[PDB]
Design a protein around this nucleic acid. Structure first.
Ligand SMILES: Nc1ncnc2c1ncn2[C@@H]1O[C@H](COP(=O)(O)OP(=O)(O)OP(O)(O)=S)[C@@H](O)[C@H]1O
Ligand SMILES: Nc1ncnc2c1ncn2[C@@H]1O[C@H](COP(=O)(O)OP(=O)(O)OP(O)(O)=S)[C@@H](O)[C@H]1O
Ligand SMILES: Nc1ncnc2c1ncn2[C@@H]1O[C@H](COP(=O)(O)OP(=O)(O)OP(O)(O)=S)[C@@H](O)[C@H]1O
Ligand SMILES: Nc1ncnc2c1ncn2[C@@H]1O[C@H](COP(=O)(O)OP(=O)(O)OP(O)(O)=S)[C@@H](O)[C@H]1O
Ligand SMILES: Nc1ncnc2c1ncn2[C@@H]1O[C@H](COP(=O)(O)OP(=O)(O)O)[C@@H](O)[C@H]1O
Ligand SMILES: [Mg+2]
Ligand SMILES: [Mg+2]
Ligand SMILES: [Mg+2]
Ligand SMILES: [Mg+2]
Lengths: 341, 319, 331, 329, 360
DNA sequence: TTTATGTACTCGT
DNA sequence: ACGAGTACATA
DNA sequence: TAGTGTCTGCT
DNA sequence: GCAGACACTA
C-alpha cells in the first residue's frame, strides 16, 4: 500500500522491534499453543496491539494469515431494522469488529459465534474497540467463550478495561502493550527514513516528531509522511510540527474561553462543538484533550486547574452514562467559564 | 353455592334522580330526558363517580320500556377496532325503528379513551351523517386521548370529585336499605378510604360489615389501610430526619409496601405538592427521581429510601 | 494438554469444589434424598457456581440422563418475555423422561428435571415477573436453578422463590490447597509464597489466579533453565505497578506542584498501567502506613473509592488518576 | 411425581384450607365470613412477595367449591399470555357463559395482575362490571403502581401485612413436627431476622440446614449452622467490626475487617446491611451525621451492586463511618 | 322531523350572509370557484389578482367547528353546483371531501393535481408531515378564530329565537374559552339553556371553568410558555402549576427537551438570585440537562422503563428553564441536534463506507 | 435518532 | 381464521 | 398609501 | 420572541 503507516508493519515476532519483554512473552505463549487462554491486549493507542495479535497468529497458525477477505451477511433485530455489518474473513482465523450503531451488537456477535462454533483446529477470534461494547455483547461472550473453550478462542483488543466488566477480565488473560519512549521511536523513524529516501538536515526532527506524537507509532508514521510530502523529502528543523484542525480549533476554543468568559463566547463554543461532533470525533477524547489544554495555560492558577479537573471527572462520568454527547460537553464548558469568572 | 348479588348492582341507580354528585350535570340530564332531544355528550374524569350509570339511567328515561330495542351498549370489553366498531355503528344507525316522535337511539361507548384515532374520526362521520336518527355518548377515563374535533362536536359534561356530602348521602341510603349498623367514626373512615370514589366506598363498607360488623374507624383501618399519598406527603414534609425515617419504616416498610411504589408515590406527591417553593419542589423531584432510578436497576434497599429522605432534608435545610 | 487449565481442572465431582463447602454439603446430602429446592447461586465471578451446578447435574442423573433432563438457557440465546412464556413453560409442562434401568441402578435419578438460567441477572424485569408461577405450578415435575453474580438485579419474588446459596470469594487462605495441588500436578515450582501472592493479586477469583499461574509456568518452560519462579515474575505478569514507582508517585504527590504532577501523570499513562491497579496500590500504601493522619486517611479512602466507582463506569483512566493525585495532593 | 415427600419444603407444604394460613388473621377471617355467609365481592390481594396470596385463593376456591373446579375456576398468570386478546376471548367466554359443572357463580384468578398492560386493565374493568352477577375477580399484585386506579377502585383492597414472629414460629414448629427435626432457640431467632417475613426464605434455609447435617435425625441445628449455610454475618461479628472501626486506627480496623472477611468468606454487602441495621438504634447528637452516613453508605452499596474491588469498598465503608462520626464534634 | 333537532344543524347558515367571521377567506373561495371555469378556459397558464387561477384545487384548514365545511357548501350552492362528497355551473359536480388529515395521501395529492372537476379540501392541520404532498398543489385558503362581532350577532338571533336571557359582553369569553369554535359555542348555549336560561357574566366564569377547550401546544409554543419568567414567579406559579408544566411537557415529550436546551442560552433570566450571573445560571442549568441525559438513556434502553417519563421532564425541560426564565432577546430556535444527527449519521456512514472498502 | 413489549391496521393468501 | 409486514404509543 | 390589533407559522 | 398576513379605519 502507498500509505507509509501500513507498509512498514511487522509480519512476525522476529520482525517486531517495538518491545522485547512483550515479544518474549508472546513467543513463550506461542511455544505451547495447546493451552492458550483467552487473550486481552491493552495499552495506549498506536502501540501495535493489532500487529502483535497478528504476529502471534502467524506464530501459532503459520503463514497465510494475512490473506484476508471481506464477506457480507444479513442480520435481523427488533422490527425490521436490517443490519449488514461486514466480517473480514480469512482462512483459519476470522476477523470481525463490532463497529455497529452501539445498540444491537448482541445479534451480530451471537450469530457469528454460533455460526463459527460448528467446527490447528481451534479458531481464534479478535474483535477491536472492545472497550465501547454495550455491556450486553460482553454478557453474551461471558458464556460463549466459556462453553466453546475447545473450538473458539477469543482475543480482546481494547485500550482499557474500565468499561469492561469483571467477568470478561476474569475469563481472559491480561497482557499489556506499552508505548515506547522517545529514543526507540526516533530509532524506528530513522530506520524508516533509511529504507526510503529522505535527506535530514538535523537528527532532531525525528525527536521532535516523537515528542509531538506522545507515544503513538501510527501518529509518528503519518506525521513523517506529512513532513516528507510537505518538505519535498528534505526534513528541516525549522519546519514546525503539523497538528490536526481538531487540535487547532480546540486550542482556539481554549484561548476564547480564557480571553472572554461571556455567554456569547459559549454560543460560538457550542457551534464549534456541533461542527466537531459532525466531524465524527468521540466526545470522551475531546473532553480529555480539552481539559489537558486548559491545564496547559500559564495564566491559570492552581485552584482553577483543580476545579477544571474536578468538573472534567464529573462530566466524564456523565458522558459515560449518557448518549447525548453535546449535553455533557456544553455543561462542562459552562462550568469552566463559571470557574474562570 | 351462589352468592348474593354484590353491592355494585344491588344498588346501581335505575333512574337519573338516584345519581348523586354535581347537581348541574344531573339535573341537566333530567331536563333533557324530559325534553327528549338529547345532544351528543363526552363524559370524562376520574372513574367510579357515575360516568356510566348516569348514562344508563338517562337512556332508560329517554327510551322508557323500549330501551332494549334502540340502545347499543358498546365498550372495550367486547371488541374494539376501526372496521368493526364502524361496521356495528353503521348497522345499528341504519335500523329504521319506530321511535317516539321526540326520541333518538342512544349509543353508549363506555371506556373509549383507549380508542384509536381512525375509529374516532369514523365516529365523527357517523355522527355527522346520522345525527337526526341516533345520538351517541362517550364515557372515558381521560378525554385527552380523544381527538379534539370529537369534543368540538359534543356537549362536554366533565364531572369532578364527589364531595363528602354526596358520598355520605349515598352511603346512608345503602345502609338504610341494607340494615347496617353505622357510627360517625366509621362513616368518616369510609369517606377518607374512598378517595372520593363511590365504588371504593361501597366496597370498604361491604367488607367492614361482612367482617367486623360494626362500622367504626378502627375496623375499617383493620380491613383497609390509609391511602399512601397522604402518608408519603407527611413523610416528605416532616421537620426532622429521624422522624421522617421512623415514619417511613413504620408506615411503609413494616406494612409491606413495595419500595418502587413508595418512590412513585413520592414522585407524584412532590409533583402535586403545594405550600413549597417551586425550585425546592424541582430539586426534591430531581433527587427523588435519582432514588427512583436506583430502585429501578434492582437496588430496592431500605437504605436507598433512607438516603432519599436524608438528601430531601439536606436540600430543605438550605445547607 | 489440548485445552486451557481453567476448563481442565473444573471440579468434576462435588468434593472437588474447594473453599465453598456450606453449599456442597447441602447438595451432597440432597443427592441421597430427593427434596431439591430452587437454587439461587450468587457470588463473585470465578467462585465456581457453574462448576458446582454442573457437578450436581452430573451426580444427580449421570451423563446419559442430563441430555434429556437438563435445559440450559443463558444470554447466548434469546431471553425475552416471549421465550420465557413459551419455551420454559412448555419444558416445565412436560412429564419427566423415564429413567433407564442402568441409570436407576447406578445413579439415584430423582424424578424431576432442572432448568438452569446462568447469568440470570441479565433478564428483564418483565421476564422475571413472568417466570414466577412456572416454578410453583410445576414444582412436582421440575426444579429451577438461577446463577447470577449480581443478586440485587434479581427481583424480590424471583429471589424469594429460590434458595440463596452464597458462593464466597476464594481468598489466599481458602484456595491455597487447590492452587498448590495444581502446582504439584503440573510440576510448577513455587519458591516461598508465589501462590500466596498470586491469590493476593486476584480479587477472590481462582480462575484469575490459575491463569496467572499458567502464564508463569509458560514463562518457566520457555526460559528452560529450570529456575525457581519468583514473585517478581508473577507480579510483572499480572500488571501491577512496581513499588519504587509508587514511592516516587507519593514523592511527587507530597511536593504539591501541579505542573510536575501532570507531567509525571502523562509519563505514567504512556506506560499503559491500569488505573484500577494504581488505585489499589495507593490504597494499600496509604492505609497501611502510619505516618499519615486519620483525617487524611479518611479523605484519601473516600477519594480512592470515588475514583474506583467512576472507573467502573467506563470513563478515561488518565483523567481519573490525574484528578485523584491532584485531590490527594491538596488534602 | 413419586409421592408428595419428593418436594421442597416451600412446595411440599402448601396450604389447601383457610385454617392453615397464619399471620393475615384479619384478611382470612374477613374472607371466611365473605364466603360462608355468601357476600364475597371482587377481591384485590396486595402484599409482599411470598406472603400467601395464591395459596389463600386456592384454599378459598377449594373451600367454597368442589374438588373438580377445572371448568369452575380459571387461573390466569404471567406464565401464559395476558394481553387484551386473552381478556376478550378466554375471560369473555368464561364469564359470559353460565357455569356448566354447577349452577353457581364463577371465580377468575388474576395472579400477578400487576404485569398486564394498561389496555388489558381498561378492557378488564368493564369485563368485571358487566358480568359481576355470576363472576368474581380476585387480583393478586405485589406492586400497586402498575395497576390503573379504576382497577384499584373496582376490587376491595386487602393489604397483606408481612408475617410477624408468631406466624413464622408456628410454621417452623409445624414443619419440625412433620419432618422430625429439632431447632435451637438461637437458630430459630436467626431464622426470624433472616426470613424478612417470608415463608419461602425460612423454609429454604430450613431445608438447607436439614441437608447440612451429616445425620438429619438426632442432631440439632444451631445458629452457627444458620450463619454458615446462608452466609449470614454473625451479629457479634458485625458489632465487633463496627467497634473496631469506631475505636481503632486505620491499620487495626482495616486488618480486622480483612480478617473478618477472609475467615468465613463473609460478603461485604451483607456486612454493610448488618452495620446499618445496628446503626439506627445508635444515638447521634448531630443530624448531619445521619445525612452523611446514609448518603455515603448508599453510594457504597450502589457501587457494590455495580461491582468492583472489595477491599477498596470496605475501606470506603470504614472511611465513611469515621468521617461521618468525626462530624459528631 | 321537527322540534327534536340539534341547534348546530337546525340553526344552520343558509347563505354566506349567515356565516360569521373569516369573511375574507369566504370571498377568496368564492372568487376561486367562480373563476375556476375561467382558469380552465385559460389552460391554467396564469393566475389572477388573488393568485388562485393556477391552482387546480382549493383547501381549507383551521380549528374544528369554525365553518369550513359549512362555508364550502354555501359557496357551492349559492354559485350553483352539484355538491358531492368523496371523503372516507349549476350542473357541474363539485367534490367536497373532508378530513384529509384523517388518513393514500400521495394518490390523493396526484388526484388534486389532475382534476377535471372543482374540488375543496377541509382539514385541521397543514404543517403535518403527512400533508407535505399537499404543500404546493392546493390553494392556501386559511381560516382562523373569527371576530367576536358577527358570531355575537348570530348568538343574539339564536337566543331571541330560543327565548333565553344573556348579556352582550359574553361573546369574548365564549370564543376564547372554546378557542374560536363556533359549533362548540352553539352546543354550549343549547346545553346551558336546557337548564339555565340566564347565561350571563355572573355564570360565565363557572361555564368557562367547566368548558375549557384545552388543546396541546406546538413545540415552539411549548418553548415560549416554558421560557417565561412570570410562570416561575411566586404569583405566576399558582396560575400555571408544576403539574401543568409537567403536563405541558407530555404534549411533545419527544421534542420538548430538545427545544429547551436549544434556546435556554438566548434568554435573559428574570429570576436571577443575588450574585447569580447569566453565565453562572447557565452552568447550573446545563448541569441538569446532563443530569437528564442519564434518565433518557435508561428509559429508551433494553430495560424500557417508561414509568420514568415524568422524571425526564423535570431534569431536562422544567428545571433547566426554571433558572434562566425571562424575556427572550431573540426568536425561538428549532433544535439543531436533529439536523446535526442526520448530517453526522451520513458522515458516520461515510466513515465506515470507504474504510471497509480499503480494509483489504 | 432512541428499542423491546404491545396494539393496531390492512393487505395478501 | 390466522399469519406477516408496517406503524404508533410507551402519562 | 399607512397606523393599530390580533391570529399564526417558525420544524 | 420574530416576523408575516389579514382586516378597519382612514
Ligand atoms: N353518583 C352516584 N350515586 C350512586 N351510585 C353511584 C354513583 N356513582 C357511582 N355509583 C356506583 O358505582 C357503580 C357504577 O360505577 P360506574 O359509574 O360505572 O363507574 P364510572 O363512574 O363510569 O367510572 P368508569 O371510568 O366507567 S370505571 C354502581 O355500583 C353505582 O351504584
Ligand atoms: N471451589 C473451587 N474449587 C475448585 N476450582 C474452583 C472453585 N471455584 C472456582 N474454581 C475454578 O474457577 C474456574 C471458573 O469457575 P466457574 O465455575 O466459571 O466460576 P463462576 O462462578 O461460574 O464464574 P462466572 O460464571 O464468570 S460468575 C474453573 O477453572 C474452576 O475450576
Ligand atoms: N400463612 C401461611 N401459612 C402457611 N404457609 C404459608 C403461609 N403464607 C405463605 N405460605 C407459604 O408460602 C409459599 C409461597 O407463597 P405463595 O402463596 O405460593 O405465593 P405468594 O405468597 O402468593 O406470592 P407470589 O405471588 O407467589 S411471589 C407457599 O407454598 C405456602 O406454603
Ligand atoms: N361562521 C359560522 N356561523 C354560524 N354557524 C356556524 C359557523 N361556523 C360553524 N357554525 C355552526 O357549526 C357547525 C359546524 O359545521 P362544519 O362547517 O362542518 O364545522 P367545521 O368548521 O367544518 O369543522 P369540522 O370539519 O367538523 S372538524 C355548522 O353546521 C353550524 O351549525
Ligand atoms: N515494531 C514495529 N515496527 C514497525 N512498525 C510498527 C511496529 N509496531 C507498530 N508498528 C506500526 O503500528 C501500526 C499499527 O498500529 P495499531 O495496531 O493500530 O496500534 P493500536 O492497536 O495501539 O491502535 C502499523 O502500521 C505498524 O506500521
Ligand atoms: Mg363505569
Ligand atoms: Mg458461569
Ligand atoms: Mg403468588
Ligand atoms: Mg368538516
Amino acid at each position: 500500500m502507498s500509505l507509509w503507516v501500513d507498509k512498514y508493519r511487522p509480519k512476525s515476532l522476529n520482525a517486531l522491534s517495538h518491545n522485547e519483554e512483550l515479544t518474549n512473552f508472546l513467543k513463550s505463549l506461542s511455544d505451547q499453543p495447546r493451552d492458550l487462554p483467552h487473550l486481552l491486549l491493552y495499552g495506549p493507542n498506536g502501540t501495535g496491539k493489532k500487529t502483535r495479535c497478528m504476529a502471534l497468529l502467524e506464530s501459532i497458525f503459520g503463514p497465510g494469515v494475512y490473506r484476508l477477505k471481506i464477506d457480507v451477511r444479513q442480520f435481523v433485530t427488533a422490527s425490521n431494522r436490517k443490519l449488514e455489518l461486514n466480517v473480514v474473513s480469512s482462512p483459519y482465523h476470522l476477523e470481525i469488529t463490532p463497529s455497529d450503531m452501539g445498540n444491537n451488537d448482541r445479534i451480530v456477535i451471537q450469530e457469528l459465534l454460533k455460526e463459527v462454533a460448528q467446527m490447528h483446529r481451534y479458531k481464534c477470534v479478535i474483535i477491536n474497540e472492545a472497550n465501547s461494547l454495550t455491556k450486553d455483547a460482553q454478557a453474551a461472550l461471558r458464556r460463549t467463550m466459556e462453553k466453546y473453550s475447545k473450538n473458539i478462542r477469543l482475543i480482546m483488543v481494547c485500550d482499557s478495561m474500565s468499561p469492561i466488566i469483571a467477568p470478561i477480565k476474569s475469563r481472559c488473560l491480561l497482557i499489556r502493550c506499552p508505548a515506547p519512549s522517545d529514543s526507540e521511536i526516533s530509532t524506528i523513524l530513522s530506520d524508516v527514513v533509511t529504507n526510503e529516501r529522505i535527506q535530514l538536515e538535523t537528527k532532531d526532527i525525528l525527536k521532535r516528531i516523537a515528542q509531538a506524537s506522545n507515544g503513538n507509532l501510527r501518529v509518528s508514521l503519518l506525521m513523517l509522511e506529512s513532513m516528507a510530502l510537505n518538505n519535498e523529502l528534505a526534513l528541516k528543523s525549522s519546519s514546525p510540527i503539523i497538528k490536526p484542525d481538531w487540535i487547532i480549533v480546540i486550542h482556539k476554543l481554549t484561548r476564547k474561553i480564557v480571553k472572554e468568559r461571556s455567554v456569547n463566547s459559549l454560543i460560538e463554543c457550542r457551534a464549534v462543538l456541533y461542527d466537531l461532533l459532525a466531524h465524527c470525533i468521540p466526545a470522551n477524547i475531546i473532553l480529555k484533550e480539552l481539559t489537558f489544554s486548559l491545564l496547559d495555560v500559564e495564566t491559570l492558577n492552581t485552584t482553577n486547574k483543580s476545579s477544571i479537573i474536578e468538573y472534567s471527572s464529573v462530566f466524564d462520568e456523565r458522558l459515560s452514562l449518557g448518549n447525548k454527547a453535546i449535553f455533557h460537553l456544553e455543561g462542562f464548558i459552562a462550568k469552566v467559564m463559571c470557574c474562570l469568572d | 353455592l351462589s352468592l348474593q348479588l354484590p353491592w355494585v348492582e344491588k344498588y346501581r341507580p335505575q333512574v337519573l334522580s338516584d345519581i348523586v354528585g354535581n347537581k348541574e350535570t344531573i339535573d341537566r340530564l333530567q331536563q333533557i330526558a324530559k325534553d327528549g332531544n338529547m345532544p351528543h355528550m363526552i363524559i370524562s374524569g376520574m372513574p367510579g363517580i357515575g360516568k356510566t350509570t348516569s348514562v344508563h339511567c338517562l337512556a332508560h328515561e329517554l327510551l322508557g320500556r323500549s330501551y332494549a330495542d334502540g340502545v347499543l351498549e358498546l365498550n372495550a370489553s367486547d371488541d374494539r377496532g376501526i372496521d368493526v366498531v364502524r361496521n356495528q355503528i353503521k348497522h345499528f344507525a341504519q335500523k329504521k325503528l319506530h321511535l317516539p316522535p321526540g326520541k333518538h337511539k342512544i349509543v353508549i361507548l363506555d371506556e373509549a379513551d383507549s380508542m384509536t384515532a381512525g375509529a374516532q374520526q369514523a365516529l365523527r362521520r357517523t355522527m355527522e351523517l346520522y345525527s337526526n336518527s341516533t345520538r351517541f355518548a362517550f364515557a372515558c377515563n381521560q378525554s385527552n386521548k380523544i381527538i379534539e374535533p370529537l369534543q368540538s362536536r359534543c356537549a362536554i359534561l366533565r364531572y369532578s370529585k364527589l364531595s363528602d356530602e354526596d358520598v355520605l348521602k349515598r352511603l346512608l341510603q345503602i345502609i338504610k336499605l341494607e340494615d347496617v349498623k353505622y357510627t360517625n367514626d366509621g362513616l368518616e373512615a369510609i369517606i377518607f378510604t374512598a378517595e372520593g370514589d363511590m365504588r371504593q366506598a361501597i366496597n370498604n363498607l361491604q367488607s367492614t360489615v361482612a367482617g367486623h360488623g360494626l362500622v367504626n374507624a378502627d375496623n375499617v383501618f383493620k380491613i383497609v389501610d390509609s391511602p399512601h399519598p397522604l402518608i408519603v406527603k407527611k413523610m416528605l414534609l416532616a421537620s426532622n430526619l429521624e422522624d421522617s425515617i421512623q415514619i417511613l419504616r413504620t408506615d411503609l416498610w413494616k406494612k409491606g409496601y413495595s419500595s418502587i411504589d413508595i418512590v412513585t408515590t413520592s414522585f407524584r406527591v412532590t409533583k402535586n405538592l403545594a405550600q413549597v417553593k417551586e425550585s425546592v419542589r424541582l430539586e426534591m423531584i430531581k433527587e427523588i427521581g435519582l432514588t427512583h432510578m436506583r430502585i429501578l436497576e434492582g437496588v430496592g434497599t431500605y437504605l436507598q429510601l433512607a438516603s432519599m429522605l436524608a438528601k430531601i432534608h439536606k436540600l430543605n435545610n438550605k445547607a | 494438554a489440548q485445552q486451557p487449565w481453567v476448563e481442565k481442572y473444573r471440579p468434576k465431582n462435588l468434593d472437588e469444589v474447594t473453599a465453598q463447602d456450606h453449599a456442597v454439603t447441602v447438595l451432597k446430602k440432597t443427592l441421597k434424598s430427593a427434596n431439591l429446592p430452587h437454587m439461587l447461586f450468587y457470588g463473585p465471578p470465578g467462585t465456581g457456581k457453574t462448576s458446582t451446578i454442573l457437578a450436581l447435574t452430573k451426580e444427580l442423573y449421570g451423563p446419559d440422563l442430563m441430555k434429556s433432563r437438563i435445559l440450559e438457557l443463558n444470554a447466548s440465546d434469546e431471553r425475552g418475555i416471549s421465550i420465557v412464556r413459551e419455551k420454559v413453560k412448555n419444558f416445565a409442562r412436560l412429564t419427566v423422561s423415564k429413567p433407564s434401568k442402568h441409570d436407576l441402578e447406578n445413579y439415584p435419578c430423582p424424578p424431576y428435571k432442572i432448568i438452569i438460567l446462568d447469568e440470570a441477572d441479565s433478564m428483564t424485569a418483565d421476564a422475571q415477573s413472568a417466570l414466577r408461577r412456572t416454578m410453583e405450578t410445576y414444582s412436582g415435575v421440575t426444579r429451577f436453578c438461577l446463577i447470577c453474580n449480581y443478586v440485587t438485579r434479581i427481583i424480590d419474588p424471583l429471589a424469594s422463590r429460590c434458595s440463596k446459596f452464597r458462593f464466597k470469594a476464594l481468598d489466599a487462605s481458602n484456595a491455597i490447597d487447590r492452587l498448590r495441588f495444581i502446582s504439584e500436578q503440573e510440576n510448577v515450582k513455587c519458591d516461598d509464597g508465589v501462590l500466596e501472592r498470586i491469590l493476593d493479586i486476584s480479587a477472590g477469583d481462582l480462575r484469575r489466579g490459575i491463569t496467572l499461574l499458567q502464564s508463569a509456568s509458560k514463562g518457566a518452560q520457555y526460559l528452560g533453565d529450570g529456575k525457581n519462579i519468583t514473585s517478581t515474575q508473577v507480579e510483572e505478569l499480572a500488571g501491577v505497578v512496581p513499588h519504587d514507582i509508587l514511592i516516587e508517585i507519593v514523592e511527587k504527590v507530597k511536593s504539591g506542584d501541579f505542573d510536575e504532577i501532570k507531567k509525571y501523570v502523562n509519563t505514567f499513562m504512556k506506560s499503559g498501567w491500569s488505573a484500577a491497579s494504581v488505585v489499589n496500590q495507593l490504597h494499600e500504601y496509604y492505609i497501611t502506613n502510619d505516618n499519615f493522619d486519620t483525617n487524611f486517611k479518611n479523605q484519601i479512602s473516600w477519594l480512592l473509592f470515588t475514583t474506583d466507582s467512576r472507573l467502573n463506569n467506563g470513563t478515561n483512566e488518565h483523567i481519573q488518576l490525574l484528578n485523584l493525585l491532584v485531590k490527594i495532593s491538596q488534602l | 411425581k413419586r409421592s408428595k415427600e419428593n418436594l421442597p419444603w416451600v412446595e411440599k407444604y402448601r396450604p389447601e384450607t383457610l385454617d392453615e394460613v397464619y399471620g393475615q388473621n384479619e384478611v382470612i377471617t374477613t374472607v371466611r365470613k365473605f364466603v360462608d355467609e355468601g357476600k364475597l365481592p371482587h377481591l384485590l390481594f396486595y402484599g409482599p412477595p411470598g406472603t400467601g396470596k395464591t395459596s389463600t385463593i386456592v384454599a378459598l376456591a377449594r373451600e367454597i367449591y368442589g374438588k373438580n373446579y377445572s371448568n369452575m375456576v380459571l387461573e390466569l398468570n404471567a406464565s401464559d399470555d395476558r394481553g387484551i386478546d386473552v381478556v376478550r376471548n378466554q375471560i369473555k367466554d368464561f364469564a359470559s357463559t353460565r357455569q356448566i359443572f354447577s349452577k353457581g357463580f364463577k371465580l377468575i384468578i388474576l395472579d400477578e395482575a400487576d404485569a398486564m398492560t394498561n389496555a388489558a386493565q381498561n378492557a378488564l374493568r368493564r369485563v368485571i362490571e358487566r358480568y359481576t352477577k355470576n363472576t368474581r375477580f380476585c387480583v393478586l399484585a405485589n406492586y400497586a403502581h402498575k395497576l390503573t386506579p379504576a382497577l384499584l377502585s373496582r376490587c376491595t383492597r386487602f393489604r397483606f401485612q408481612p408475617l410477624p414472629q408468631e406466624a413464622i414460629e408456628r410454621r417452623i414448629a409445624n414443619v419440625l413436627v412433620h419432618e422430625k427435626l429439632k431447632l435451637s432457640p438461637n437458630a430459630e431467632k436467626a431464622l426470624i431476622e433472616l426470613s424478612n417475613g417470608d415463608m419461602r426464605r425460612v423454609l429454604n434455609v430450613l431445608q438447607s440446614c436439614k441437608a447440612t447435617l451429616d445425620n438429619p435425625d438426632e442432631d440439632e441445628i444451631s445458629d452457627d449452622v444458620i450463619y454458615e449455610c446462608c452466609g449470614a454475618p454473625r451479629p457479634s461479628d458485625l458489632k465487633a467490626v463496627l467497634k473496631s472501626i469506631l475505636e481503632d486506627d486505620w491499620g487495626t480496623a482495616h486488618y480486622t475487617l480483612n480478617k473478618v472477611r477472609s475467615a468465613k468468606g463473609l460478603a461485604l454487602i451483607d456486612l454493610i446491611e448488618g452495620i446499618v441495621k445496628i446503626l439506627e438504634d445508635y444515638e447521634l447528637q448531630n443530624e448531619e451525621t445521619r445525612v452523611h452516613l446514609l448518603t455515603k453508605l448508599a453510594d457504597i452499596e450502589y457501587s457494590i451492586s455495580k461491582g468492583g474491588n472489595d477491599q477498596i469498598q470496605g475501606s470506603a465503608v470504614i472511611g465513611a463511618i469515621k468521617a461521618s462520626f468525626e462530624n459528631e464534634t | 322531523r321537527e322540534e327534536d333537532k340539534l341547534w348546530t344543524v337546525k340553526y344552520a347558515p343558509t347563505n354566506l350572509q349567515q356565516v360569521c367571521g373569516n369573511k375574507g377567506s369566504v370571498m377568496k373561495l368564492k372568487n376561486w370557484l367562480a373563476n375556476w371555469e375561467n382558469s380552465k378556459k385559460n389552460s391554467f397558464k396564469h393566475a389572477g389578482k388573488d393568485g388562485s387561477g393556477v391552482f387546480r384545487a382549493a383547501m381549507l384548514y383551521g380549528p374544528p367547528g369554525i365553518g369550513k365545511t359549512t362555508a364550502a357548501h354555501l359557496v357551492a350552492q349559492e354559485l350553483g353546483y352539484d355538491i358531492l362528497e368523496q371523503n372516507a355551473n349549476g350542473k357541474h359536480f363539485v367534490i367536497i371531501m373532508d378530513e384529509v388529515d384523517g388518513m393514500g395521501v400521495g394518490q390523493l395529492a396526484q388526484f388534486c393535481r389532475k382534476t377535471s372537476t372543482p374540488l375543496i379540501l377541509i382539514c385541521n392541520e397543514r404543517n403535518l408531515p403527512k400533508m407535505r404532498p399537499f404543500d404546493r398543489v392546493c390553494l392556501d385558503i386559511q381560516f382562523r378564530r373569527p371576530d367576536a362581532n358577527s358570531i355575537k350577532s348570530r348568538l343574539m338571533t339564536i337566543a331571541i329565537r330560543e327565548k333565553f336571557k344573556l348579556d352582550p359582553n359574553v361573546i369574548d369569553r365564549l370564543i376564547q374559552t372554546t378557542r374560536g369554535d363556533i359549533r362548540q359555542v352553539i352546543n354550549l348555549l343549547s346545553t346551558i339553556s336546557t337548564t339555565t336560561k340566564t347565561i350571563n357574566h355572573e355564570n360565565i366564569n363557572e361555564i368557562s371553568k367547566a368548558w375549557e377547550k384545552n388543546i396541546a401546544l406546538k413545540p415552539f409554543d411549548i418553548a415560549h410558555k416554558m421560557l417565561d419568567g412570570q410562570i416561575y414567579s411566586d404569583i405566576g406559579s399558582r396560575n400555571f402549576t408544576l403539574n401543568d408544566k409537567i403536563a405541558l411537557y407530555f404534549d411533545d415529550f419527544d421534542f420538548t427537551p430538545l427545544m429547551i436546551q436549544e434556546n435556554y442560552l438566548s434568554t435573559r433570566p428574570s429570576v436571577l438570585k443575588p450574585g447569580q450571573s447569566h453565565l453562572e445560571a447557565v452552568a447550573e442549568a446545563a448541569n441538569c440537562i446532563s443530569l437528564g441525559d442519564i434518565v433518557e438513556k435508561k428509559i429508551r434502553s433494553s430495560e424500557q422503563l417508561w414509568s420514568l417519563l415524568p422524571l425526564h421532564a423535570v431534569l431536562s425541560s422544567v428545571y433547566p428553564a426554571s433558572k434562566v426564565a425571562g424575556h427572550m432577546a431573540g426568536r425561538i430556535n428549532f433544535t439543531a441536534w436533529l439536523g446535526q444527527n442526520s448530517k453526522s449519521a451520513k458522515y458516520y456512514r461515510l466513515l465506515q463506507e470507504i474504510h471497509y472498502h480499503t480494509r483489504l
